[PDB]
Amino acid sequence: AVDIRDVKISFPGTQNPKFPHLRFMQTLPAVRQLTVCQRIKPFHRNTGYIFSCATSNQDNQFITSMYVKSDGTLNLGLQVNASSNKYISCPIEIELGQWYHVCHVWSGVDGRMAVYANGSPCGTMENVGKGHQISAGGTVVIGQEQDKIGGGFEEQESWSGELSDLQVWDEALTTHQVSTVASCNGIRPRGNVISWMEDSFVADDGVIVGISHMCSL
Amino acid sequence: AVDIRDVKISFPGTQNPKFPHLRFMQTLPAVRQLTVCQRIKPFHRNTGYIFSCATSNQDNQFITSMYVKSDGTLNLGLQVNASSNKYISCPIEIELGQWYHVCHVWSGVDGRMAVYANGSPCGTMENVGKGHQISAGGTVVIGQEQDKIGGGFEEQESWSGELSDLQVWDEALTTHQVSTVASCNGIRPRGNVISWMEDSFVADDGVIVGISHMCSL
Amino acid sequence: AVDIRDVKISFPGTQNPKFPHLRFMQTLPAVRQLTVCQRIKPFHRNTGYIFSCATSNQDNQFITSMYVKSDGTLNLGLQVNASSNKYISCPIEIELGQWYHVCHVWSGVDGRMAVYANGSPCGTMENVGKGHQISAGGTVVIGQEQDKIGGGFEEQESWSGELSDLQVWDEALTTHQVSTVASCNGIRPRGNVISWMEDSFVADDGVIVGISHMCSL
Amino acid sequence: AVDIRDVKISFPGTQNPKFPHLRFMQTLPAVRQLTVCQRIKPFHRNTGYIFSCATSNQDNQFITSMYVKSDGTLNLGLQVNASSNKYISCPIEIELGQWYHVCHVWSGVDGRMAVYANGSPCGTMENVGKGHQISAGGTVVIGQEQDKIGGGFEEQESWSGELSDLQVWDEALTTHQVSTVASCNGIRPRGNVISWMEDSFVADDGVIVGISHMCSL
Amino acid sequence: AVDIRDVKISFPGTQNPKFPHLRFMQTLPAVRQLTVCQRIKPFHRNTGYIFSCATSNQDNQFITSMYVKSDGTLNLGLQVNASSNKYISCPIEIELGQWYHVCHVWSGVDGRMAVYANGSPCGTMENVGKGHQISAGGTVVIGQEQDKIGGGFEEQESWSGELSDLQVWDEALTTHQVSTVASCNGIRPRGNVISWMEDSFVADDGVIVGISHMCSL
Amino acid sequence: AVDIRDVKISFPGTQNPKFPHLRFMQTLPAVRQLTVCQRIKPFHRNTGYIFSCATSNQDNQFITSMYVKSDGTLNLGLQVNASSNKYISCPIEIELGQWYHVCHVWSGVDGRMAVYANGSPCGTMENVGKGHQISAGGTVVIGQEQDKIGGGFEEQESWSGELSDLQVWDEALTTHQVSTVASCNGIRPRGNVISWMEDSFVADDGVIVGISHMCSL
Amino acid sequence: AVDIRDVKISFPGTQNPKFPHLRFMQTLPAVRQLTVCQRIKPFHRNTGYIFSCATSNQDNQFITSMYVKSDGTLNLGLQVNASSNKYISCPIEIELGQWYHVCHVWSGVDGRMAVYANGSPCGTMENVGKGHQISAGGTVVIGQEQDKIGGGFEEQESWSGELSDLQVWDEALTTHQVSTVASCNGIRPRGNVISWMEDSFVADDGVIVGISHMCSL
Amino acid sequence: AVDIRDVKISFPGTQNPKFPHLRFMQTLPAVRQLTVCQRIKPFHRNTGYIFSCATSNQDNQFITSMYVKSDGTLNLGLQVNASSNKYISCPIEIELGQWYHVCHVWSGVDGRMAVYANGSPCGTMENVGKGHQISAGGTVVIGQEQDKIGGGFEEQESWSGELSDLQVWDEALTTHQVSTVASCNGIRPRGNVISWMEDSFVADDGVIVGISHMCSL
Amino acid sequence: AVDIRDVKISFPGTQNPKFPHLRFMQTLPAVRQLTVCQRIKPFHRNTGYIFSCATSNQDNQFITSMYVKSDGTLNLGLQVNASSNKYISCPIEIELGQWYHVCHVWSGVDGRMAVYANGSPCGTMENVGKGHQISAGGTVVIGQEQDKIGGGFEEQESWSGELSDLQVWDEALTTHQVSTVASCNGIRPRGNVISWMEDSFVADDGVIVGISHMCSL
Numbered sequence A, B, C, D, E, F, G, H, I: 001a002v003d004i005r006d007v008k009i010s011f012p013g014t015q016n017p018k019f020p021h022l023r024f025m026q027t028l029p030a031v032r033q034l035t036v037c038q039r040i041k042p043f044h045r046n047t048g049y050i051f052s053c054a055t056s057n058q059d060n061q062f063i064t065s066m067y068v069k070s071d072g073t074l075n076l077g078l079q080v081n082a083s084s085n086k087y088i089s090c091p092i093e094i095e096l097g098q099w100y101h102v103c104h105v106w107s108g109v110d111g112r113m114a115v116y117a118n119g120s121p122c123g124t125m126e127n128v129g130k131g132h133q134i135s136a137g138g139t140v141v142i143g144q145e146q147d148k149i150g151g152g153f154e155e156q157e158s159w160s161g162e163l164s165d166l167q168v169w170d171e172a173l174t175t176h177q178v179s180t181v182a183s184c185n186g187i188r189p190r191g192n193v194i195s196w197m198e199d200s201f202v203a204d205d206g207v208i209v210g211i212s213h214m215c216s217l
Ligand SMILES: [Ca+2]
Pocket: A059, A060, A145, A146, A147, A148
């Protein structure tokens, strides 16, 4: 039938005190590199945090985000160890309500940041979490930005849209590897740290469970 | 990989004001018969409502429930058009925390009620919604008993446990058909009104999305 | 996918001036024998006319009907050239809201009538339209009894329930042939005069187009 | 045999008080995007509404329509949240009585409207239901324009012709996806919200059930 | 599709001056033996001539006929060189309007007559055309008894019913051979003198061309 | 063996009171479009009516005809609702006694007429039965022109020759579809309203039943 | 083994009162067209009649013949309804004692005559039996010219040589069809009126039965 | 080659300050049930803790252990929420230095404990962690008993021997499931919480990485 | 599943008294040539010793190392019989945290040293251990540089990063052989002296056992 990876979650919209989000049951192990990929259907052009990882000592261990410029250009952001959000624009025009595959590749070892839109590299950036190692026990939240383990959400920092096929590796994937990940008919690799629908997560505040039609109709 | 039908939802436990539940996005069409089957892992012996269907004029259109006696005997209940809960005991000893397949078959045409535990018939009952037709637009909630469309939940009426493979037909399946439905390796039929993971639903109050290991390890 | 023969029509219920029914676009050719088979899910125990054939000179050319006794016994009736309804009971207990296959075999040549329930013979009767030939141009209506071409319906003569797989031959099928017709996984023969979903018909007064789950779930 | 998707409905013609139409049994879930495709054989050049969706608070939630210019040019229209009918002409000459595949793609997220004729894009339009979300519970009627849930039809707004293969998604399909939908021998995708012959509907006022010969003879 | 051998002809009924019949275009060669087999659906119990062969010098060269007794017993008759009709009864009860396979085997060499009903021998008779040889040029008529080449029909001698699979050999087939001929799924042998639908014939006076459902539904 | 579609009928010649023809047992349903195709072997150059459809109110509902000019050019004619015979010449030289495939495509919806000779389009014509709908119950006669249901034939309007593979659709086939119909080795499509040898017809006045050798020797 | 179609007959030579010939047991049905093909090995250059057809009223219904010019050119002749022998020469040099395939195609409908040598057309001729129809009951003789049914032979009109594969159709085959007939390894079509070795014939006056080595050695 | 599941770890022996052990990188999610299976080669008969799970608030969340009686009987122990070690003896004689498959199945829901030796059930016990839920974030250590997260080891509580194929589920496997797990050539199921060699772990104090020869030589 | 060769070890980082390393259980046999290949993910640019071999009489029998220049150039070093570290730079830019395949080929017979990066030769060097033979009994340590059998580690000489697929031969592989070794999808050759995961080794001081994603995702 439908592949379990085609399951999607809808993040309707946020307005205090309702904060639709997902919280992964099991925290992350300590890591020195991290690659987060997923298919997203953005609802707004304004900045929103998609993947948020926090520990008791640091609520901003690792946070991915995006926003669309006026011309429609996609902009992927990343923040490590509470640094400022680093952005890299992608040569692709975003149409709210449409599907796109996005990856954020980070390496604390050399401090390099690289983002991808639909399997292609948009560019890279230096000095992003250089020498930093995310402490063991990070809690992951999707759709909201944590200011506290599993909470302290701000509505202007939430992300609304549809999401599916979230795959996370504790390695910094290569340009060729990422392309095989974004591919709809490839082998469809699975993250070793988090594999969509293979790692239980908590659903709260009205997120909608449905089916993504990006890859298959 | 894993079949999308093996996805399960955990209903942690209920305590005002937190009521873990699922609400199906699309309401049901009018029906004269209804068959609801699913795999459940009960957490408590006390009565709990699993499948709740309500319309503006009647919050108790159709409600399934269960409870376990002291000797461990399973008891499946059904309520139609706000009748009293009708119960039929099953010749099977329930162990909280273990998986079981259960079906509730109702026919407003002749007013017959029949329940099944693991593909086998437990017994039938007469005069249950005889002549009744559920009005179009019923809202379905899983894990809580509605006293209002999508709400008005009571904690002593909630149902805690794990659930998966929810299949619903607007027909009254036969004894042979039900057996093919409960089978783990059969053809695994899909409900025509609601097919698990094929009909979007809203998740709220901390339900946990995971994977059922009843059929496959 | 689903076989087009599994399409079903629901006849909700009749109450002046609403008469749910089907009227076949093309009239029947003259015949001397006729076999009408179909799958039915009866809603009431009282007499109802299923297949009605009328010509300008005779509104009661050929009419099939059924009713269920108090003990649940099925009774199939037939009327030819405005004779009285001839009935033959079947050794099967009917449960309103459940599916059954039924055939009416008539031969004006020898005047014999034979009915079948689920591919098996219930019995036969003599002197039913003996020597009669249905005149060319008969109009066929399903669910209502014509007192006029395509009309003049009476509520107490209507038939409510679900129907599918209507097959009609201008020959008097044999006992062995009938059994192959009723079979769900056989060759599934098609009528040469009327073949379900292959001969267009008019739908009126709220009949519901759906899918029969008798043969396949 | 014939694929169940080749079943067609004929909308004979409308004249008070007879309004041939179809009403889907189950209402639609709330949506933010919607794609409606189907094969049509138009009988008149004048404007007619094909797909009509209404809720208690808004009878004009979503309505598709078409008309043919004097030179024969096809014009597909769309109306969202009671806006004015937006039209986009297609570079194709229509011959009444012939088959054509048509899709209407709408996205309330960015407010974009796009129409397709025979799998090809005719053009797009902005500001059509921008920011609008169709409320849960929409009733769908085919062939007539609702001014009230399931009724309030106007003859000059009806649509006569033959229709089949109605597929509806709660997503805004892409240009490439649409082409795979229109194709007669492709995979023939099925809508996730409404799939022709898989979602029961009520037939009234003389619609004719037949077989479409567009794809296969 | 349907095998051309399943084509059937209906002989409605005879009443001066209308005599439904078939006349084979090509006359028969001289013969000393002849076997005529066919599937028939008799309409009346009274005597009727099925196969009639006549030459200018003898209108009664070879004529087959049948009639049913009161008890329903079949009786096959044969007449050679204007002898009296010889009859042989068959241990089978005939039901007018039903199909049966019948063969008439004649040998002028030894003067033996043998008839078969459904591939089985009913009995034989001596001194029937012993030493007789049908002269070349016999005209064959089906359904009527010739008193003149291709004419001079008498209504009380006509045969009404349905007929198909007419096979004629200029040899006297064996008991085993006949059984293979009557078989519906055997090899279905074809006559060497006349092969149904392979030897053109003239149709007159309202015979009806249709399809036999004896062998296949 | 030989395909049942290769059966042919010979229309010897007409001379009062003998009018060789065929009359289809079952009348046609009401239609708004009609396509009639068949293989013909014309015997004369003068006008002859091939397909004649009549109702009690109109004996000239639909009539096809042909004639050959002096230069041998084929001319196909059509008449709807007693209009004048519309003719379209075909760029092909006819040799009496030879086989040709011919189709007449009519659409009352737009009033267009199109004819084909051997799968190719000869041309089209406007305003032919524009807005007309053939009333239900049309009687079809082949070889003669009805001035009364099933009768009132005129010899100078009869058509002599050989005919086979008569296929009739209640739709107006496309140019590509027609080509697949005329093809001898294609899929050989079958008409949905009338399928040669699949819809019984009455044979009268000496028509000859034989086998067409157009497609196969 | 050897195909029965390779059987050949030798016509030694004629001299009163010995006339080697073949007479077909069964006479021909009435025809309006006729195609006669066969493989011949001519022994003399002088005119000889190969295929002779006669009825009581006309001994020269249809007669084929040939002769070879001094330069060796083949000349095929035909005579219908006692017309004069029409000849068409073939661009091929004949060597007495060698094999050749020959066809005579005649159409009384348009009066056209066409001959073929080795599957290729030699030419055609008009006004040959135009409007003529061979009466039913023609007797066929091979090797001699009848002046009376089955007799009245003249030596100077006989034809000596070897012959095989005689195929006769009551249709006027096309140029392409003829070529498939002459081919030794094609499908080897069989005549529908007379098929070599499938239609019994009388052998008299010393004809020799052997095997043709034209097609296979 | 060798299956990655056949990798084994040797726990040499413990003596302050050297404590050979394994610490899983990623902590466990909250659980209500837990099944831990693995292949072990015990070195001593005295009590040793194999699987130790601790959280900041409770160092004895879940601990498995074993010891061998003097007669050689195996004894499997379990401790939940700092209860006393519960033991169940197995009807199998242990030989130090040999391989055995062992599973510990615990369910906090009903408080039942069950142990298995080589895929077979040894017995069960009640009231073991009844109503207890292990808090999220448990740290897992193999070979040593934690008195503090990842430390506070005691020599007399260590476990020496060889271990491999550690599989852990957050469900309470059934008797039949367990047997499929212990099987060497079965499907070899993998734990969903911890899968040997698929979930990184820290190795310290001289553990030896080698290859298990229990299943394959 | 995953190939056992994809197992990797992480060397976290070194700081007295913690020295993460691996010590192979079985010492090496005497050798005159040695080839050491493995996949490495370096964490620092500064010099680190990867493979260290020592005997009681010589702690620096054979030691491999690497460092990265400021421009990112890779530099592979080798030391034999306590010579000075010989370095050869590779035309490849190293990115800390990324995977690379590296081989060190040494031959005491001719004293030649050759290094490879990703299966390609970087260059060679002479006079490196020329005439030297490593004495039997060498102890191998990975990640630390021995100054004593299995110990005497210095932090500034340690190597941090991830490593897998360690293969060692007592022969000096050729350029072509090396390339087949580095290949991810080749035959993946195994060392004859040490084969990753096939020769047991001791793990100490927090090395992490995980899975390499260089070759497969
Ligand atoms: Ca924060």
